[PDB]
Nucleic acid binder design. Structure first.
Ligand SMILES: Nc1ncnc2c1ncn2[C@@H]1O[C@H](COP(=O)(O)OP(=O)(O)O)[C@@H](O)[C@H]1O
Ligand SMILES: Nc1ncnc2c1ncn2[C@@H]1O[C@H](COP(=O)(O)OP(=O)(O)O)[C@@H](O)[C@H]1O
Ligand SMILES: Nc1ncnc2c1ncn2[C@@H]1O[C@H](COP(=O)(O)OP(=O)(O)O)[C@@H](O)[C@H]1O
Ligand SMILES: [Mg+2]
Ligand SMILES: [Mg+2]
Ligand SMILES: [Zn+2]
Lengths: 619, 49, 571, 596
DNA sequence: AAAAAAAAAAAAAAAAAAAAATTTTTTTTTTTTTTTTTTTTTTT
DNA sequence: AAAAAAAAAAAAAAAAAAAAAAATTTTTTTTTTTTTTTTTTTTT
């Protein structure tokens, strides 16, 4: 029953062959084809706004009736990529078409995935809940008869959504002469298959209501793009399933969402650049490399006044040091960790929310919101196979990322000790009788504790006034003390800054109703993310001069004479402090894009620790 | 239960030949609520219907 | 392949614009319903577009549908007045479209199967006539490869059923609702319906129980005719292949048994239902019917078979019969204007060839030798058909109005001899035999040939040919026939003159009454076998000679030549 | 499923492609494939003897296993003609094979065909008995959706003798969304389909036995290859038909013969032409022309002594005259008819049987062997479809040939009244109620009759010695008298020759090409024949004690023209000259005048 | 003129083909409940 | 700071819902082959 011609399919394939034809235009989709051919990836992502502007009617048709339309799209894609390279187009029996763009009415959530959107490519944000085992599914199965020296290739059609017949589902095992057939597993062809479950986000979902979730069938090309707990935006074809054969049916049609693509809804893996921006960063580095750390430090966290040393230190954190894994796996960490301890109303939590909004893969942990098993990882059984699976915790999620600890003082001693190996080695070695593992959480921690008595007493020593053990304060590599001096002069400073920011408005965008390298220098007062992201990768090695100077300054800090009487130490100088010196030096050099840590960065690091650690308790 | 063609071939169609076409079903939203009696309506000693 | 909306646009513009508006006049006439059938001509369509013509030749049926619907939509703008509604069928179609207008609601959309169909509401029919480029192909050669192809064929007819009403669109009415559903028929059979898909029924959940009737239906003039290969077309030794042809509308009642036909049509299949596959019968759906090649004074008679020499008076009498004496039915008793000739002869004078030429000549002719057509071959018999004991005819009843050239009348079967006596005497054939109780009507004229009393006593002319060997006669005839072998009026023109000559209807004058009575009595004395039959012979020959002259009044010249002919024959 | 590897099929196609190549070895099948390409034919014919000569084991596989090896063969032919030509192989979608040669144990009759040859390639002798009306079986059916404007095409396959389920043989009538279709008959493909019924040949069956018959199935370019009463020889595959869907089977498997080739009797051998044949016949035409007819008639039937003039007349009938057809529709026949008659033991039946053995389309018949309806055509009833039907008699089968009648005098008079049609026209006007016809039966008639009284009365006129009338003797163009002259030298030479014979192919080649040849006559011959026939038509032509034999007529002149043209065909001159006219004059004189 | 051969039509019988056809039970899955361990939290 | 008590977590076991799984020949029709009877056509 081969079709001779259909006007609908011919028209649609012609339209999308034109859409892919990008030479008279800027060459965007031709470039996409060429790069995916170079990559060996076999999905091409077409923006729905592009499709709508070039032909709104086809966008309406496709977003109302997907599968056959996308069959047309993918056949056009195969023809097009064959014209670019027939040899590669022959390689894969199919090529696929992902989507992107403004799915205006077609953006709902699993609470609002009604029965109006069937066979329509719906867009839906949500949190994963499950990750079924990614197991093969046979597509083209080859067999060998040894009695008759015969070979066969049974063929299967992916009728995951249509009606499926036993004649289609037969797996042959005997010839016509009732001989034995041996499967040829290697010569057969398979595609991965995984089920997952998207859920309405609890931050988005209604407050008092049960969760609502939708099932998503990721075939090949989308195997491990979604684990449990992740934020993911899924765009694809909500449809119905066939009940297996049987003379009766209730009307029930359990439905799925055969995802056309899934992307990270975090939108924090954002290295999006242009060559002009690369040149901008390069000049920003090289022209004023020596003052660039202070440029960045003053820049970072606007809408707050002073705390310039803390801004420098949070830069040292975000830029990070450099992790070291020596010959035998002795892993010496390369992350900073900062403890803000200071009076109330000192914007400590505001700094935390700043790094939450800016640093990629930042996550908040409260004192008694998160707790232990939540903080670090966990081991739990499946109950569908009696096998021990592992549930990654907050820190493990924040591997190579940031965690903002609100009210660190209030975490009980059990969790305060549970954070120990993540603090030093960036791993959690968990185990119960079935399964054990060393989950890796190379995290960085910015923690805002509050003082004992609810406010720092100036005359009392910091060790008395902090309700935290010397054991932990060793592991923390910097402890910054933020006092409210209460003087009128600095009060004038802070107050004018604060009320200026209360007066700053969306420029032009607002009327009175409430809700580039450098910045346009607004009197009342992006590239930060770009530059720090590129900065993270560089491994500026320490010079001999820097190593000798940093060593001698550490020896001086260890010696008691370096602190005068009437000052009180805030954190004892263990060797963790030397490693702190090296890490802060590397972070400064990374700010400079140095490719070598020099005496400038070394003396900046020593200045940092000297201000941070030794406090002047007054009488 | 039985295909109605009279033209399936010289032989006839088997018994129970029909498979539901899932895609060609036009469907709707439905919801099974669990309504419980009004607490002030429930008499004294009884249980909520 | 192509797009048939484009093809329909092409043919619509064509039919509007081609030429006096050649097709336009036809279109307006059928719009007013002054004609019920239409005929496309592929020569007239190759006048401009050859690709469309080749496509029509290769898939003619579809384009037939296209053309007919195109003309159906061209209809109303060509319509200009109110037609008088000449049929109860006209009343039905007018009423139907009236109520459609009444409950139209023009914005309201209706299903793809809720509409009066074209095949019902057309009231006209559209056929074709294949191009001169399309060679008429052999009936044997029209194989499976030529199924669907447009094809013309030339063949003799063997037997033709009558006009019984084939169903086209059966009409059913309901027991509760009152709508009227259609079952458009295509095939030899249809299972009736018993449930009504009218939307009122679907709303009510009532028993349909619709009852078929003939009132609102659409029947049609349908015949299944048979055809047979030309004996010249036939290969070296095989018998002639037959073929079934289906005749519809204004193609009905053209061909008749024995008359050569050229039929232009398409070779479409019917379901056969013992080997697997999907077998199928073959019928040719006729779309133009043209009888051809048999049924479309001195020099004239010499033009009657120039290849024969001598027998000039014989040829003149043959011309005379071919004109035919005046048909008369005065005072009830019939005096038929047929002329009956017998040629008794020595062995071999081309009398059989004369009979064969007359067979090729006359618009109806049947050349029967002794025993190839005996009993039922000459008489009429019964055969299975809508299966039924169809009584059909043999040679004479096939030649009901024409000329039976009977060869070797001497050695015929005695029943054949009796039947021929009956038909010469009374132009009927009475039968009260085993499964036949009839009185066939056979208004035929007999040309007997034979070798040497009842013959003399029942005829209008007997001619004895004795080739007494005369040296100069045989020398001239020998030169003539040798020249014939050496070198190897036109028949159509001859037959045209005869055809016009048939219809002048003279009436005898009173001036010749004395002459004819005197000649009759004088011939009787010269005899003293002659009698009233010979009186009628001279009188019929006189009427026919007046017809040959084309004047409406018989004269003395006519009777003189008649007596000349009869004297020559007797002596 | 689709087969990826098959040692049997791959080696079969390899061996076939190798065999059918044949260009390096004598180009037999290269020439045959080029011939069917040029002639626009797609059913090759293959000498199984040559297949055995090249690859014998392949031959045994082919014979003992038919369907598989034939599928492999036809696909190998598809690839081979694809190599030699592209557009042609694209145009024709599947290229059949037929088999031919010698099939040792498998060359059987419908009696000896047991179930042992099931699924194998048999070669069955025997006549045809039935011929079904040819019908198209649908093989690729195209449909058009009026609503959707899309065109589909369901396909089918030759499930004639294999497993067949309803899914294959469904035919569309509805669209996937209940939008009824319109079939496109012209765009579709079709295959004609006929079924004949071979029977064991009536002589070869053991006597007193009801004969054995086998059904045969025919398809494209094989349907109108054999009518009823054909002495066919069908090579084909013997198989079983599946009784459709059961639930209870008796195990009785009906059988058929799917014909892969059809042939008639080999005697109609118009194509036997080659370089040696043209060379020798050109030599015969050119080096001698004044004695072609004499030498050929002398060597015609060497066994029988003498009969020089009668054998010359036999050759005149054999070559024939020229059928002269007129523009007006008149037709003057070109074929001579002859009536031998003579004393017993004058080889009359032997001349008849000579013609029967040598000539093409020569039909025997004996006096009361055929009675009327047998000799001329007959009209029967089909008895299944109700219609009439024409049954071709001996004469109709013999059209453009010869019929040899033995015991013509003892043939009933009714038969001669029947052949009054054929003896001049060559056409039979058979007719009954439901079918009138005019059957081409244009064929010569040679006849043998013994005279009345058992033996020819030497002392009576031929009109009294012959029990036939002027009409019949006129219908016969030629009548010949043969008498055992008991002279001593005559008896010496006849007996010597008889004993000598008690102790050809070039002629067969010559006769049909001469029959093809169509001479034209000269004005010299025309005047000569006119005056010679005028001389004959006179009492002065004959004399007392020499009575005529047949009633001289314009038929006599016409048949003299036919005789002269026949002698011209013998001479290959394309010009009926005075030589031919004189020779015909001598022949007609001797045949028409006899002493008393 | 009587006999007989053939034709068409009518009937019987054997082989093949046609047609008719929901209900009961089992198993996965989901969801809670309960026990016992582990963990955490309050007390002296 | 460590012991006792309580709360929560983890894991095994049970009860119902709803989707899957399994069983499953016999009687009637009707075409085709064969024979038989009455009649007409043809032959002795
Ligand atoms: N260094 C600062 N510069 C400007 N504003 C500040 C500063 N410190 C505190 N504030 C103001 O005081 C408020 C304190 O809020 P928050 O930081 O949530 O509490 P805490 O400082 O106790 O963590 C902020 O909203 C901010 O407007
Ligand atoms: N003048 C003539 N023209 C044509 N043919 C002639 C003529 N005279 C004689 N014949 C021939 O005479 C032959 C016998 O004629 P035919 O019709 O058999 O006469 P019949 O049947 O009465 O004996 C024909 O074949 C014909 O060719
Ligand atoms: N002229 C002859 N030469 C040789 N043999 C002859 C001749 N005439 C007759 N015979 C022989 O007579 C035998 C039978 O003759 P046949 O053809 O039966 O004649 P008829 O038909 O008169 O009986 C044959 O064996 C044949 O050889
Ligand atoms: Mg005659
Ligand atoms: Mg004999
Ligand atoms: Zn109704």
């Amino acid at each position: 029953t081969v079709v001779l011609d259909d006007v609908e399919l011919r028209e649609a394939q012609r339209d999308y062959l034109d859409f892919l034809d990008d030479e008279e235009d800027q060459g965007i989709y031709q470039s996409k084809v060429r790069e995916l051919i170079s990559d060996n990836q076999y999905r091409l992502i077409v923006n729905v706004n592009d499709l709508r502007r070039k032909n709104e009617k086809r966008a309406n048709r496709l977003l109302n009736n997907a599968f056959e339309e996308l069959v047309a799209f993918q056949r056009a894609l195969k023809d097009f990529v064959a014209s670019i390279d027939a040899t590669y187009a022959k390689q894969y029996e199919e090529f696929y078409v992902g989507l992107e763009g403004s799915f205006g009415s077609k953006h709902v959530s699993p609470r609002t995935l009604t029965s109006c959107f069937l066979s329509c490519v719906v867009c839906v944000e949500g949190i994963v809940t499950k990750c079924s085992l990614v197991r093969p599914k046979v597509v083209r199965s080859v067999h060998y008869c040894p009695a008759t020296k015969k070979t066969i290739e049974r063929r299967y059609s992916d009728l995951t959504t249509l009606v499926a017949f036993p004649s289609s589902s037969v797996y042959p095992t005997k010839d016509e002469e009732n001989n034995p057939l041996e499967t040829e597993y290697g010569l057969s062809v398979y595609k991965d298959h995984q089920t997952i479950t998207i859920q309405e986000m609890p931050e988005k979902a209604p407050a008092g209501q049960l969760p609502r979730s939708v099932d998503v069938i990721l075939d090949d090309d989308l195997v491990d793009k979604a684990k449990p707990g992740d934020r993911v935006q899924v765009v694809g074809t909500y449809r119905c399933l066939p009940g297996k054969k049987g003379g009766y049916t209730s009307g029930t049609f359990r439905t799925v969402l055969i995802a056309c693509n899934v992307k990270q809804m975090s939108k924090d893996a954002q290295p999006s650049f242009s060559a002009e921006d690369i040149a901008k960063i390069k000049k920003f580095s090289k022209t004023r490399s020596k003052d660039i750390f202070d440029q960045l430090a003053k820049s970072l966290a606007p809408s707050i006044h002073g705390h310039d040393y803390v801004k420098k230190a949070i830069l040292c954190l975000l830029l990070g040091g450099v992790e070291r894994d020596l010959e035998n796996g002795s892993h010496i960490r390369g992350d900073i960790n900062i403890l803000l301890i200071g009076d109330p109303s000192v914007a400590k939590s505001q700094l935390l929310r700043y790094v939450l909004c800016t640093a990629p893969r930042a996550i908040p942990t409260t004192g008694r919101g998160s707790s232990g098993v939540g903080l670090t990882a966990a081991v739990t059984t499946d109950q569908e196979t009696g096998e021990r699976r592992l549930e990654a915790g907050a820190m493990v999620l924040a591997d190579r990322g940031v965690v903002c600890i609100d009210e660190f003082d209030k975490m009980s001693d059990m969790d305060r000790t549970a954070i120990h190996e993540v603090m030093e080695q960036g791993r959690v070695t968990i185990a119960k009788a079935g399964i054990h593992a060393r989950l890796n959480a190379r995290c960085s921690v910015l923690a805002a504790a509050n003082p004992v008595y609810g406010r720092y007493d100036q005359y009392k020593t910091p060790m008395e006034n902090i309700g935290l053990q010397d054991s932990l304060l060793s592991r923390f590599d910097l402890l910054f003390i933020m006092l409210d001096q209460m003087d009128p002069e600095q009060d004038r400073e802070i107050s004018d800054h604060v009320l200026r920011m209360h007066r700053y408005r969306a420029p032009g965008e607002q009327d009175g109703d409430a809700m580039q390298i450098y910045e346009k220098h607004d009197n009342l007062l992006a590239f930060m993310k770009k530059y720090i992201h590129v900065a993270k990768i560089i491994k500026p090695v320490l010079t001999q001069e820097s190593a000798t100077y940093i060593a001698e300054e550490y020896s001086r800090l260890r010696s008691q004479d370096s602190m005068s009487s009437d000052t009180a130490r805030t954190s004892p100088v263990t060797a963790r402090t030397l490693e702190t010196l090296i890490r802060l030096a590397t972070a400064h050099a990374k700010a400079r894009m140095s490719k070598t840590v020099d005496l400038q960065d070394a003396e900046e690091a020593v200045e940092l620790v000297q201000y941070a650690y030794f406090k002047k308790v007054l009488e | 239960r039985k295909c109605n063609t009279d033209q399936a071939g010289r032989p006839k169609c088997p018994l129970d030949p029909y498979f539901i076409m899932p895609d060609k079903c036009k469907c709707v939203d439905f919801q099974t609520l669990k309504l419980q009696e009004l607490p002030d309506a429930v008499p004294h000693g009884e249980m909520p219907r | 392949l192509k797009d048939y909306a484009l093809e329909k646009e092409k043919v619509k513009k064509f039919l509007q614009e081609f030429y006096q508006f050649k097709y336009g006049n036809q279109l307006v006439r059928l719009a007013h319903r002054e004609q019920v059938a239409l005929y496309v001509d592929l020569d007239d369509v190759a006048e401009d577009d050859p690709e469309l013509v080749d496509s029509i030749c290769e898939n003619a049926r579809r384009y037939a549908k296209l053309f007919a619907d195109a003309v159906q939509e061209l209809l109303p703008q060509y319509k200009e007045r109110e037609v008088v509604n000449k049929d109860v069928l006209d009343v039905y179609i007018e009423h139907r479209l009236m109520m459609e207008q009444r409950s139209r609601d023009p914005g309201m959309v209706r299903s793809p199967q809720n509409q009066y169909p074209a095949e019902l509401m057309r009231r006209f029919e559209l056929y074709f006539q294949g191009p001169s480029s399309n060679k008429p192909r052999v009936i044997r050669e029209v194989r499976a490869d030529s199924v669907g192809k447009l094809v013309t064929v030339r063949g003799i007819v063997t037997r033709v059923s009558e006009v019984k009403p084939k169903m086209v669109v059966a009409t059913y009415t309901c027991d509760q609702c009152g709508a009227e559903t259609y079952q458009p028929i295509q095939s030899p059979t249809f299972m009736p319906l018993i449930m009504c898909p009218s939307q009122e029924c679907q709303t009510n959940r009532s028993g349909g129980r619709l009852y078929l009737q003939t009132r609102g239906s659409r029947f049609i003039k349908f015949q299944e005719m048979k055809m047979q290969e030309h004996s010249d077309q036939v290969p070296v030794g095989n018998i002639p292949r037959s073929i079934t042809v289906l005749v519809e509308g204004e193609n009905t009642r053209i061909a008749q048994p024995g008359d050569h036909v050229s039929v232009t049509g398409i070779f479409l299949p019917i379901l056969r239902t013992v080997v697997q596959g999907l077998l199928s019968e073959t019928y040719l759906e006729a779309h133009r019917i043209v009888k051809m090649n048999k049924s479309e004074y001195e020099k004239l008679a010499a033009s009657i078979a120039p290849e024969i020499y001598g027998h000039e008076d014989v040829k003149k009498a043959l011309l005379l019969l071919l004109v035919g004496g005046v048909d008369q039915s005065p005072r009830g008793m019939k005096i038929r204007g047929n002329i009956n000739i017998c040629l008794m002869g020595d062995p071999g004078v081309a009398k059989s060839q004369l009979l064969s030429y007359i067979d090729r000549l006359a618009p109806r002719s049947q050349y029967t030798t002794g025993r190839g057509s005996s009993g039922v071959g000459l008489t009429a018999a019964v055969l299975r058909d809508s299966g039924e004991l169809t009584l059909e005819g043999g040679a004479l009843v096939l030649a009901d109005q024409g000329v039976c050239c009977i060869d070797e009348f001497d050695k015929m079967a005695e029943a054949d001899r009796t039947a021929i006596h009956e038909v010469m005497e009374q132009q009927t054939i009475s039968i009260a035999k085993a499964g036949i109780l009839t009185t066939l009507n056979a208004r035929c004229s007999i040309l007997a040939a034979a070798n040497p009393a009842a013959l003399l006593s029942r005829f209008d002319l007997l001619w004895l040919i004795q080739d007494r060997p005369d040296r100069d006669n045989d020398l001239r005839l020998a030169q003539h026939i040798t020249y014939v072998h050496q070198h190897s009026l036109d028949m159509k023109l001859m037959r045209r003159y005869i055809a016009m000559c048939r219809e002048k209807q003279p009436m005898v004058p009173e001036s010749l009454a004395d002459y004819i009575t005197a000649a009759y009595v004088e011939m009787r004395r010269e005899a003293w076998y002659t009698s009233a039959r010979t009186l009628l012979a001279i009188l019929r020959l006189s009427t026919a000679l007046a017809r040959l002259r084309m004047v409406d009044v018989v004269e003395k010249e006519d009777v003189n030549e008649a007596i000349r002919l009869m004297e020559m024959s007797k002596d």
